[PDB]
Amino acid sequence: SAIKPDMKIKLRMEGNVNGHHFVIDGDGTGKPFEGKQSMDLEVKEGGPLPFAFDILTTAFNRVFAKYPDNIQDYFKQSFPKGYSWERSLTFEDGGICNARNDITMEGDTFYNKVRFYGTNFPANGPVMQKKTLKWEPSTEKMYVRDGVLTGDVEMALLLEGNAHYRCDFRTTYKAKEKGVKLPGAHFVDHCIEILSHDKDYNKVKLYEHAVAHSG
């Protein structure tokens, strides 16, 4: 009821990876009930980025997921006040990232305040050498841990030379308003894709389709 079938999205990300500082703006639209969104991104400071753009893409909102009637939708029930999430990303060669997003809504627009910090990526590894191609489609497991809604996903970045580079996500999600009821455990399938880009990934168009289910 707060959430319309078509919503606009505004975003700013600030961050630092291996010491490199950057600022990225996003402008997008999506369909919350169909689980589809896309976004145009533009690096404003720090470009051309010296690391694989792909590590950032899942930090650029689980409101855009199709939920069936039989699973409580914690994210759509969080609005208009909104919610926040914090994520750790643990890569198999020791790279580590922490990201957060604080999401608010004004009228027909979501605003996103995103922070992304990464460290310990080996200078000779696929992230700093820009050898990544895409994330594989994934399944996030949603459950409650110590009273907090938690999503785990085992992610894989396809690399040049048909190898995958693995990363474990853990995200915690918290409604701003007390007493939004927690859902039962469930799954969210995701597919995220870079649809287009320019030479050094200073301008990128991103898309995600996500669908909640019970297994």
Author numbering: 2 to 61, 65 to 219
Quote the study's own text.
We collected datasets for the dark on-state using two different methods at the SACLA/EH4 station using the DAPHNIS chamber. Firstly, by using the grease injection method, we selected relatively large crystals of 50–100 μm in size. Diffraction was collected up to 1.9 Å resolution with diffraction still present in the corners of the detector. The hit-rate could be carefully controlled with the crystal density, and levels of 40% could be sustained with crystal densities of 4.8 × 107–9 × 107 crystal/mL. Table 1 shows the CC* and R-split values that reveal data from the droplet method was lower quality than that obtained from the grease injection method. The comparison between the two on-state structures collected with the grease injection and droplet methods under the same conditions (Black) showed the lowest R-factor over the intermediate resolution range up to ≈3 Å resolution. An increase of the R-factor for the increased resolution (<3 Å) is likely indicative of genuine structural differences between the grease and droplet methods, in agreement with the observed degradation of R-split and CC* when merging intensities together (Black). The dehydrating effect on the crystals due to the mother liquor being replaced with a mineral oil–based grease matrix in the grease injection method could explain this difference. Following complete refinement of all four datasets, both on-state structures showed no statistically significant density in either the 2Fobs-Fcalc or the Fobs-Fcalc maps that could be assigned to a trans chromophore structure. The same was observed for chromophore omit maps, that also, at lower sigma levels, did not show such density. This is in agreement with the dark incubation and dark sample injection which corresponds to a 100% on-state concentration. Photoisomerisation is clearly seen in a comparison of the “on” and “off” refined structures where the dihedral angle of the chain connecting the phenol ring to the rest of the chromophore (N–C=C–C) changes from 1° (cis) → 171.1° (trans) in the on- vs the off-state and the pheonolic oxygen is displaced by 6.2 Å.
The mGeos series of rsFP’s display similar switching behavior to Dronpa. The series was developed from mEos2, with mutations that remove the undesirable irreversible green-to-red photo conversation, increase fluorescence brightness and provide high thermal stability of the off-state. Skylan-NS represents a further improvement, with reduced per cycle bleaching and higher photoswitching quantum yield in the on→off than Dronpa. We present high resolution room temperature SFX structures of Skylan-NS in both ‘on’ and meta-stable ‘off’ state collected using two different XFELs, the SPring-8 Angstrom Compact free electron Laser (SACLA), Japan and the Linear Coherent Light Source (LCLS), USA.
